[PDB]
Amino acid sequence: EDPPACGSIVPRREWRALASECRERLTRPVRYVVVSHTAGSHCDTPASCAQQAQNVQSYHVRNLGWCDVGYNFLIGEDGLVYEGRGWNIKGAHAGPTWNPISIGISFMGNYMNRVPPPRALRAAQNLLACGVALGALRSNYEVKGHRDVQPTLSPGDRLYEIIQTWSHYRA
Amino acid sequence: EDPPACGSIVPRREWRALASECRERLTRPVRYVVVSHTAGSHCDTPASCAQQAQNVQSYHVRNLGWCDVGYNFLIGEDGLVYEGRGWNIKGAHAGPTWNPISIGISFMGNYMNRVPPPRALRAAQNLLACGVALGALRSNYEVKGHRDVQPTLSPGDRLYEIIQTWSHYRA
C-alpha cells in the first residue's frame, strides 16, 4: 500500500547484533526524536561501521548490563543507517521522561569539534522521513538535542548547531 | 573522640542557589557513589567556583526544568565542596536505576586530559569520610564512575583513572 519507500537501513542481522532482551514497546505515532552522539570513534566504511555498531552495543549490554544497545538507530559517516531497537521497542537514551515518548537516533562519533559528512546528515534526515511514511513518527515530529533534555555535551558542539537549524527542531 | 567531625561544605546560601523544589527522599545509609564531571569549565577561587555552581544549577533547573541542580554535591578545584541537593534528597545523575540508591558528586570542569589538583581530590574524599561519619553513606560503600553506569565519557579518562585507585571503587 503506497510502498513507504524509505528502507535503506542495515538490519541487526547484517551488522551482527547480539540478540535483544528488551521487550517494552513504544506507542506509535511517536512525537519526539532526540539526537545524540556516541562520543566514541567515528567510522567511514560499511565495514568499519559494522564493527563500531557492534562495539557501542557491546559497551551497552556487557558493561552496563542493558537489554540491548540503548538507541533506536545509529547513523554512520558511511552514509548508512543502522538498526538498533527500531521503530517499536522503547530505547534507553534520555531518561524516564523522554524514553517512553521518543525515538533516539545517534551519530557514531565525537562531534564536539567536527561536522558529520553530508551523506551522514542525509541518511539522518532521510531516516526521519521514513519515520513519517511508516507512521512511526508524527507527520509533525519534534527534533531535540540530547543536551536539551540531559546534562550532557551530546550531540557535540558543531552537530548541535546543525540540528537547531532543522525545521522540526523545537527549543 | 568520635562526633560528626565532618568536612566543610559550602552551604547553598553562600553560593546563592535558587530554591530547591525537590521532594524525593533517599533512604540512608546509602551504598553507592557515582563520580561525575560537569564537562564544563573549571574554577580556582571560592569566588569563581560559587559562580560555576550557579551556571550548572540554572542550566539544570530552567533549561531542563528540574527541581534543583542534579548533583548532591559539587567539588571545586578551589578545594571546597559545594552543596548540591545534599545527603537526603534523591538526585538526578545516573538514570532511574542508580539515582535512588546512590549519591552524586561532580567535579566542576572537564577532565579528559586534565587531572584535578590534590585539593579537589582531598575535598572529595573528606566528603565521603564525612558521609560515613554521619550515617549518610554505608560504611562499606562503593564508588563507581559515571561511565560505569551509563553511556558517557564522564568523569573524564584521567579522573576515572584516579577513582579506580580508591578503595570503595568496585566493578
Next chain:
Amino acid sequence: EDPPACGSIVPRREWRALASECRERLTRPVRYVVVSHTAGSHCDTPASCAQQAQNVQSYHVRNLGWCDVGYNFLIGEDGLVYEGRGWNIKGAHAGPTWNPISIGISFMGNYMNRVPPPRALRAAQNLLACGVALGALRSNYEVKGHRDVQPTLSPGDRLYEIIQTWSHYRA
C-alpha cells in the same frame, strides 16, 4: 563460586511434590521476574501451605498435563518460599514470549482484595535477593506484574499495588 548468602526455601521432597518431568533450561542469568497469584485458597501454617503447594502442582500436572507446576517458586502466607521448578528450569506462567526469559514466583491465594502478610512479602524479596547472590538473577533484574505481560488481573489489584513500590519494578 559466588554465593554471598541465600535464603531458606522448602524443598520439593518436603512438600511432597511429584517428580518433575521438565527438561528445558532457562539461560542464565535471568533479567525478568513476573509476580502473579494462584487465585486459589490461602494458608498460614507450614502444614497447610505444603498441602496447598501440592494442589496447585497437581492441577497443573494431572489436569493441564504440564511437566510440572507452572511457577518457579511458590510463596506462602506462612512466610516460607516453596520450591517449584526452581532457578534452572523454564516454567509455563505468562505466555511464550515471556516464559523463556523470566522467573515466575506466585503468591498462594487470590489477592484481589486481601493483602499478603508482611512475612510473605519478605519471603519473596529475600528470594529475589538470593537469586542475585546465586547469580541466577542479574543485579539488574526487573520485577513485572503478570498483568503487565498478558491480559489478566493475576497479581491481584492490591498485591499489584504493593509490588509497584518495590525497588526493581518496571513499567
Next chain:
Amino acid sequence: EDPPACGSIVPRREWRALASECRERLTRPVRYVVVSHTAGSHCDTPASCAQQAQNVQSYHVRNLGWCDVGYNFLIGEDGLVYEGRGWNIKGAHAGPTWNPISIGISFMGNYMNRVPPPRALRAAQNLLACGVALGALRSNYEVKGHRDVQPTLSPGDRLYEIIQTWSHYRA
C-alpha cells in the same frame, strides 16, 4: 529492610515485643555462635510462635528484670527466625565469659526427647549466612553448643546431636 540477603527475619514490631533497654554494644565481628533451647513450650505456626516469643521476653523483662529478651535471635518450628537483641546489642545467654564475644540463637522448645523440624534447622543456618553477609559474624565463625560453654542440659540431647553435624561446629 535489615541490609542485603537476610533470610527473612521477623521484626520486634511484628511479634509485639516490648521496648529493649539494653545499651551494651557487641564488638563486631563476632566469632562464636551459641546454640541453646528455651526449654519452654514449642510452636509450629507463626501465630503461635509470636505469642511464644512474647512469653520468653516478658519472663526475662518483667520477672527476671533484664533489659530485654536474653537471646539475639529465637527460632520457631514454624520455620521463622525471630528478632530479639539482634546483631548489635550484646546478649544474655551464656554467662560473662561468653556473652560479650558470641551471638546467641535459641530454639523455642525443649529438645531432649524431641527433634526440631528441618525448616527450623534450615532457618538457623540461613540466619548465620546473613550474619556473614552483614559483617556481624566472621566468615570463619565457630558454633558451640550451650553445654560446651556452661554446665547446662540445653540445647537438649536431640538438638545437640544435630549441631555436631554442622560444619562450623568446633570442639
